[PDB]
């Protein structure tokens, strides 16, 4: 029971995982068992969702968040988001469950039975947190693995059946991307766009060619950076800029993950390309514009406005959602805005069906899963999957920002040596001159 | 020794739960208030007083159960079980809202007993009775809201009903009818409560982050001994930190802890004074100059005028169901709507 | 030394009356800009067409407001979530009319308050302190982000952000209750528990420490003079306070550890306010509070109202009046 | 001479706190005084 | 605006009378030694 009590380790039970900081084998076991937990949730949740999936009904009307992820990859779906077969969903769930059993076995072995420290057993797997070269080597290996994953998404898009394109003409279809955007100007212009209204930063990616080209760039960049970090040591500015300890690296990862969680919240709220409205449901702007367009064709068989910069837009409060772009609306949008005569005599039945269906499913609901306004009776059970994903990931991103602050401060204090409190005989403020 | 002295020694004997002389008032009254609330929220309806279901037996949940106030036609009757309204019948007593007055009166005397318990324990332990002084503010809030406010109004009906959603209704009622947010006494109450929460968080974090290293463990909690004479945290370092961050800092620990006493207690007392004013409908509903300006200028629009419109909407849309004794029949055309404004 | 080392030593100096630091070299200009723009807008800003329907709302003192009713009106609904600096408007009149000062103030304030949190960490590092006061400050900062940034992002317009004024804040509260039923949201209930408990525990801790002060004075002088700044001995008897509080409820409900007690004092309102800020953000993505309408039906099918139905009636009354 | 007379003290911190209390109360209640 | 005019003197007295009081006490504290 070495380092498994407060007296030897210095950490209480509620900080008991902090006893794993200098125990590489048990730390690896904790990580592998946790990865097994993640893959287990993926497999089990996919099997649960499939067990409760009605393929005829839309996915967003049944509270699914994992089946839409597989469907966006072009697996088991056809034109218009229709589910041609459900077997690949089952395959994904089962393979994840089995792989999670394997990872759980490895995690339990390394945490319980295997060597407590990996340093004496293997020079390659043994690591010290202060060894900057070994940290950069492990970071390089993981960067190569991440680049391979991005290229796996690319390979799925170009060769293994393609991806679901909601922007495909006729109402969206599974399409093989043959011409990805390799031009660095477009790809990094997405990085250089403003995050505000009408611009939307990388969330405003609106075609799969840009998505696949950006993933080609990301995979190549990650592989190159992985090779670079295997081959090199940190420079002097890097060594003087950072704290080099396990808690410090954890805090850096926590800050990165918090930022990524906020970005994913905005992606699932605004983007309808990598989160198609066929599976995930309409966005809030999408539902409002669908309401305006449907009531317009109702009243013509609504109102129009002029916008701050002079474009023909839907009138009303939905003037705030004039930057919305959707596959069912772009055929109607002309050079100066929504071409009204082109609404009158170019409207297609699939566009009207999409607009009415997206009218009825605005992303508004309650915690007890009651749809509609908060002042309305409980006759409709619909909270949008976009709402669930955005809310949950904002909560997680904020708490991970808090964790980043906690661990970054603690890492700095522990590196400087006052994380346990102020030394009574060497209190720094006493040596400092008084402010006045 | 005399029966009084022997009883006094028995009442103040050290045990797991202190009894004391104040226990004779506190324990029965607090037990009866809590038991009456649980009994009412579990079994007792509000169908005959409010036209509402408010018990688990009727199908409500924890958020929506309440022991509701008596009907408005009861007036300010004590509604005793043996009184002229219930005439000894427990069932009619429950149906008429007698459990509300039961809980309110026993809770009032229980709060009196708890404050006397604070005084008694401070006397025997040998400390100054500032905890009782601080507890005067919840008592002021309870007396102003649950007793003085309905006594100033028409009946017990307009007091808060003992429940979660019923209290939320009470909040919305005060917004719609009293404009209670505009009241400066409520503003001082909000400042007291939020400043007390801020002081709690800031003092706890400051103490926890200026601790002296008194142990070798990375968990600092075991580095404290209750019988130690030294300070466990550096007041000098904390003062320096807050002086350079905020401009000012506490330098006297005794003044700091008195200030922590002072802020929420004063806030709650100010809010109780405002609630007394609302008991007589003496509200800060409006600013007369802005009323005259809005009457003479149809284009003048501030957030205060929009709040007045929202209050009018609250009143007209909630009054027929929240005040069913008045038999308010508001036709659709008299209900205020934004699209007719 | 060169100018850069002298500047770095001045910036990170603990001998400055107010600490600057690098977070402070961002914090001071942004907060000064936000403060100056707020004072000028609160006194003298022209009316703002917040709904974009040519019906401007006057918020400044010079246009017929007092301290209570004055506000900096949020930017126009026609602006939406668009970035609206001064140079994006054709004229200063157009920038003022569309609520540009609100955007300037809130962006500068959010940046300055984030750097205020960073500066709190920075000074704690320079003084050899433990670093987690900034973690406690992250709860009101999260609340400010929720009401000024996250709720506009979810609703799609900075016109739905909280106005910078007292009556505007009340308007924000009432419209929020109308649209989201925040009172029935458990995160707001956790926030209310956080602030009520924070006030309770603040008064409790203050009264217990004041109750057990050690006699160092006379009746003719204030007891605060019994404490010397920087004295080594404790100024109050924590054992006597623990004995009192243990006899008040029972012995196991009382903290004998002052460090555990002060951690609890920090943790309760901070966690509660974290949850209420997250509640505001999650209702920004329209995940609203519990509905419970028509939850009790009799045998014949007639709806039996509850208190939640009265709440929904009030919410509908607010809803019909805040629209158009 | 009366032997019960004692000196009265108000430190600068108490002056600042009292001035803050008075000025903030005046800022709060001035709108209601003007009405 | 058509305010109560007495509010002015009210506000002024509300500022002046207590604050002056404190100032008096403070100044006579500083002259004691």
């Amino acid at each position: 029971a070495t380092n498994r009590d407060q007296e030897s380790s210095g950490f209480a039970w509620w900080a008991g995982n902090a006893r794993l900081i200098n125990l590489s084998g048990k730390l690896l076991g904790a990580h592998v068992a946790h990865a097994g937990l993640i893959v287990f949730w993926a497999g089990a949740m996919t099997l649960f969702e499939l067990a409760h999936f009605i393929p005829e009904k839309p996915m967003y009307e049944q509270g699914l968040i994992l089946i839409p992820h597989i469907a966006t990859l072009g697996w088991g779906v056809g034109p218009g988001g229709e589910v041609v077969d459900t077997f690949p969903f089952f395959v994904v769930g089962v393979v994840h469950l089995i792989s999670s059993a394997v990872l759980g076995f490895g995690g339990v072995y390394h945490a319980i039975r295997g060597p407590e420290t990996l340093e004496e057993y293997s020079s390659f797997f043994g690591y010290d947190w202060k060894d900057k070269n070994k940290m950069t080597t492990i970071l390089g290996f993981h960067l190569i693995v991440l680049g391979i994953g991005a290229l796996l998404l690319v390979a799925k898009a170009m060769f293994f059946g393609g991806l679901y394109d909601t922007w495909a003409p006729g109402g969206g279809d599974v399409r093989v991307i043959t011409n990805p955007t390799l031009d660095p100007r477009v790809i990094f212009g997405y990085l250089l766009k403003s995050p505000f209204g009408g611009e939307g930063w990388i969330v405003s990616v609106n075609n799969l060619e840009d998505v696949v080209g950006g993933h080609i760039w990301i995979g190549l960049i990650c592989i190159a950076g992985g090779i670079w970090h295997i081959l090199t040591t940190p420079f002097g500015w890097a060594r003087r800029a950072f704290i080099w300890s396990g808690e410090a690296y954890l805090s850096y990862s926590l800050g990165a993950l918090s930022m990524m969680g906020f970005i994913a919240t905005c992606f699932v709220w605004f983007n309808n390309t990598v989160y198609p409205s066929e599976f995930y449901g309409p966005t809030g702007p999408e539902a409002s514009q669908a309401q305006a367009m449907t009531f317009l064709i109702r009243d013509q068989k609504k109102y129009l406005m002029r916008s701050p910069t002079g474009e023909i837009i839907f009138g009303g409060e939905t003037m705030r959602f004039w930057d919305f772009r959707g596959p069912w609306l772009e055929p109607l949008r002309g050079p100066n805005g929504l071409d009204l005569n082109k609404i009158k005599n170019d409207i297609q039945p699939w566009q009207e069906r999409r607009a009415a269906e997206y009218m009825t499913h605005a992303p508004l609901g309650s915690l007890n899963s009651v749809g509609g306004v908060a002042t309305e009776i409980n006759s409709v059970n619909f909270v949008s999957p976009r709402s669930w994903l955005a809310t949950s990931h904002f909560v997680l991103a904020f708490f991970f920002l808090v964790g980043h602050l906690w661990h970054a401060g603690r890492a700095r204090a522990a590196a400087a040596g006052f994380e346990k409190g102020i030394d009574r005989e060497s209190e720094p403020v006493l040596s400092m001159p008084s402010l006045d | 020794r005399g029966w009084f002295d022997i009883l006094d020694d028995w009442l103040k004997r050290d045990r797991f739960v202190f009894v004391g002389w104040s226990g004779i008032l506190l324990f029965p009254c607090a037990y009866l208030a809590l038991g009456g609330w649980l009994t009412g929220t579990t079994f007792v309806t509000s169908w005959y007083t409010h036209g509402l279901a408010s018990s688990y037996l009727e199908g409500c949940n924890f958020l929506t159960v309440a022991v509701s106030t008596p009907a408005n036609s009861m007036g300010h009757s004590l509604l005793l079980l043996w009184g002229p309204e219930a005439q000894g019948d427990f069932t009619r007593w429950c149906q008429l809202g007698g459990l509300w007055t039961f809980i309110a009166l026993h809770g009032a005397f229980g709060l009196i007993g708890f404050m006397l318990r604070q005084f008694e324990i401070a006397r025997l332990v040998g400390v100054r009775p500032y905890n009782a002084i601080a507890f005067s503010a919840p008592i002021a809030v309870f007396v102003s809201v649950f007793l003085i406010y309905p006594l100033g109004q028409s009946s017990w009906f307009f007091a808060p009903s003992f429940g979660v959603a019923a209290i939320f209704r009470f909040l919305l009622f005060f917004q719609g009818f009293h404009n209670w947010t505009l009241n400066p006494f409520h503003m001082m109450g909000v400042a007291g409560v939020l400043g007390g929460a801020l002081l709690c968080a800031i003092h706890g974090a400051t103490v926890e982050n200026t601790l002296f290293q008194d142990g070798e463990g990375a968990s600092t909690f075991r580095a404290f001994n209750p019988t130690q004479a030294e300070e466990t945290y550096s007041m000098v370092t904390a003062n320096r930190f807050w002086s350079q961050i905020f401009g000012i800092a506490f330098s006297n620990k005794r003044w700091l802890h008195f200030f922590m006493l002072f802020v929420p207690v004063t806030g709650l007392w100010m809010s109780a004074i405002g609630v007394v004013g609302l008991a007589l409908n003496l509200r800060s509903y409006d600013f007369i100059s802005q009323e005259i300006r809005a009457a003479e200028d149809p284009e003048f629009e501030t957030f205060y005028t929009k709040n007045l419109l929202l209050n009018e909407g609250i009143r007209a849309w909630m009054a027929p169901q929240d005040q069913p004794h008045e038999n308010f029949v508001f036709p659709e055309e008299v209900l205020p709507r934004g699209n007719a404004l | 030394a060169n100018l850069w080392e002298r500047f770095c030593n001045w910036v990170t100096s603990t001998d400055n009356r107010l600490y600057v630091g690098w977070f402070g070299v961002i914090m001071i200009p942004t907060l000064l800009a936000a403060t100056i723009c707020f004072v000028i807008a609160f006194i003298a800003a022209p009316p703002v067409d917040i709904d974009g329907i040519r019906e401007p709302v006057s918020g400044s003192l010079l246009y017929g407001n007092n301290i209570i009713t004055g506000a900096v009106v949020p930017s126009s609904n026609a602006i939406g979530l668009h970035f609206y600096p001064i140079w994006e408007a054709a004229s200063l009149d157009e920038w003022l009319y569309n609520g540009g000062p609100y955007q300037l103030i809130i962006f500068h304030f959010l940046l300055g308050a984030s750097c205020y949190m960073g500066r709190q960490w920075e000074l704690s590092y320079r003084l050899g302190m433990r670093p987690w006061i900034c973690v406690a400050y992250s709860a009101p900062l999260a609340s400010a982000f929720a009401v000024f940034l996250i709720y506009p992002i979810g609703q799609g317009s900075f016109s739905d952000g909280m106005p910078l004024g007292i009556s505007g804040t009340f308007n924000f509260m009432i419209v929020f209750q109308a649209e989201h039923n925040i009172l029935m949201h458990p995160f707001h209930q956790l926030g209310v528990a956080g602030v009520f408990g924070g006030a309770l525990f603040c008064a409790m801790h203050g009264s217990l420490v004041t109750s057990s002060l050690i006699r160092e004075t006379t009746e003719t002088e204030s007891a605060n003079y019994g404490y010397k700044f920087g004295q080594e001995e404790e100024t109050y008897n924590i054992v006597a306070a623990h004995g009192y509080f243990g006899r008040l409820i029972f012995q196991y409900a009382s903290f004998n550890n002052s460090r555990s007690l002060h951690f609890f004092l920090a943790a309760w309102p901070v966690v509660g306010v974290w949850f209420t800020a997250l509640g505001i953000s999650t209702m920004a993505f329209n995940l609203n509070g519990f509905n419970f309408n028509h939850s009790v039906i009799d045998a014949k099918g007639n709806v039996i109202n509850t208190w939640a139905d009265i709440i929904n009636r009030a919410n509908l009354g607010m809803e019909v009046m805040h629209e158009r | 001479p009366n032997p019960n007379r004692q000196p009265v003290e108000l430190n600068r911190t108490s002056l600042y706190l009292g001035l803050l209390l008075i000025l903030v109360l005046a800022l709060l209640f001035s709108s209601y005084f003007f009405n | 605006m058509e305010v109560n005019q007495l509010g002015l003197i009210a506000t002024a007295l509300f500022v002046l009378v207590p604050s002056v009081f404190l100032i008096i006490l403070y100044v006579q504290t500083e002259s004691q030694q």
């Binding site: - | - | 009356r17 | 709108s31 | 500022v15």
Partner: peptide, 30 residues
């Protein structure tokens, strides 16, 4: 005179902030 009163009280508060920060009685150890 209403606006003048509000701005005057606010300016007095800001001046009091200045004097309370930079002209405070200094805390002295022991």
């Amino acid at each position: 005179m209403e606006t003048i009163t509000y701005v005057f009280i606010f300016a007095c508060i800001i001046a009091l902030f200045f004097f309370a920060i930079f002209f405070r009685e200094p805390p002295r150890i022991t």
